[PDB]
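[job 0412] stage=fold_complex status=start
inputs:
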Amino acid sequence: VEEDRNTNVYVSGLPPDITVDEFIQLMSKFGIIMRDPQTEEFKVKLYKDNQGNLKGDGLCCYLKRESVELALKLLDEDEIRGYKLHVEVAKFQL
Amino acid sequence: NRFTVAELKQLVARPDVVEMHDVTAQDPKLLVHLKATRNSVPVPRHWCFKRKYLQGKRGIEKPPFELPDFIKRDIDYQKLHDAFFKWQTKPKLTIHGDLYYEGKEFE
Amino acid sequence: QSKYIGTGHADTTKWEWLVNQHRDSYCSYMGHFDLLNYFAIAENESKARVRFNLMEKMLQPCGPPA
Amino acid sequence: LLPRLTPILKNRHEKVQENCIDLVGRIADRGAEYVSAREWMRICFELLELLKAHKKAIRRATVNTFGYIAKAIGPHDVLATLLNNLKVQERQNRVCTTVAIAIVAETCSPFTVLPALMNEYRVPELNVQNGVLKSLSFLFEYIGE
Amino acid sequence: PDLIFCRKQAGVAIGRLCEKCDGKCVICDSYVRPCTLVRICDECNYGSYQGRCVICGGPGVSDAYYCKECTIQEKDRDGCPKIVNLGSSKTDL
RNA sequence: GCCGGCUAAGAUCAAGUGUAGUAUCUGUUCUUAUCAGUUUAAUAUCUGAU
Ligand SMILES: [Zn+2]
Ligand SMILES: [Zn+2]
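[job 0412] stage=fold_complex status=done
writing structure:
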């Protein structure tokens, strides 16, 4: 039903040698926090992020939709220590 | 132990702006004389009201801030300063002493 | 000494307000030039005369209960 | 040199960061284009957190560089970025972002941030108009004459 | 959070500030457009008090100034602008 | 807020949580009464008698 005003941002093209603190720091550049139950979500690996490193995708949430839109319009193809990464709204993944 | 509301209102030479609560001060004649200024501005209407001028009519029903046409009617080069600094409208509000009352806009 | 001398507070008497009024209104008379060369033209007195008069009036002007 | 000096500004060194701020500023001094808009926006977003450092030299260099950065990038883009950044970066370093908006008022004409920030008050949010007022405070406090 | 000041006879001693408290004015507490330099009294630079910050109360790294919004208001013409109160007195930790 | 009223108009006691600071939440009572004093711009409040 709902089409626009999405708070789910999908970051692709992340190196498998990345951690969760770096993802939190990158998400803080465009947001504040999404630690509703305990904390915010992260990348979903093969064995629930236990055995594998990362399945080339990470999820990020924000309090408002304008912040997510600004991040997607500004953090597009952001260069992290391993490579450049792209940002999308849905991308047909989660 | 003080002048009544009539004795303190007749002895003064300008009872047109006399107040009932003002007659119980420490110097009623001094307050009456000071209130007789040429074009001063008296105390606001929230002197005795205990509603803070915001709790009574707490249900405000109006836009927050309508965009003025003095500036709304690269961002703009030959029309930005030519519409805000050129086609600007002067804000016509109160002049000297229209102290904001509780409502002050609905009545 | 110099904490707040020049003005009273919440229950300042009218006389004690006018006393400070005159006591700080003459200092703008003994010090300022236009308001001192203008009073010596009306009273027709010298600068020293009017200044000494204003200084002696600072004892308890406005009508003193002394 | 721009992408090479970009990670250098992220260092925590006092003198190193102080020199890198002036270097990034002078990089956009004469010609000043020499960049993609996204790179300049990212550099500004990174430097916005250093506008209230302990050392006053870094605080002065950040303001000296952000003026040229905003003059080279553009009024509307920088204004929209600063406005979107108001909700993020909760009130421990948020006010510095407002100062950045004032930098735009110090970097561009008054009608570069006035009409854009005016539409930010039409939103009925409480701590949106509150932030707009807190930003206009520093704007009129640093806009000068 | 109402800070107190010395407010004594402003001598011929210049002001100072710490590495972190050097920008803001000793009274206005703002970093915007410093106008004039702050001063101190005779009991503000005496032995151990030599070269101390007027806000941080420690080491001096610069000269204490006033804000342009605090010097135009004639606030600098008051006494010693040293930030000292009952808690921030001489016998303080 | 709705078509003068439906007790969401005020003051106040006990406890919890938390801050540098402001605070936030739960449970009461509200004199339905009179006089004298204190006091309040006036209420209120408190101090005593009935
Ligand atoms: Zn200091
Ligand atoms: Zn001192």
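[job 0412] summary: Chains A and C do not touch (no CB pair under 8 Å).
[job 0412] exit 0
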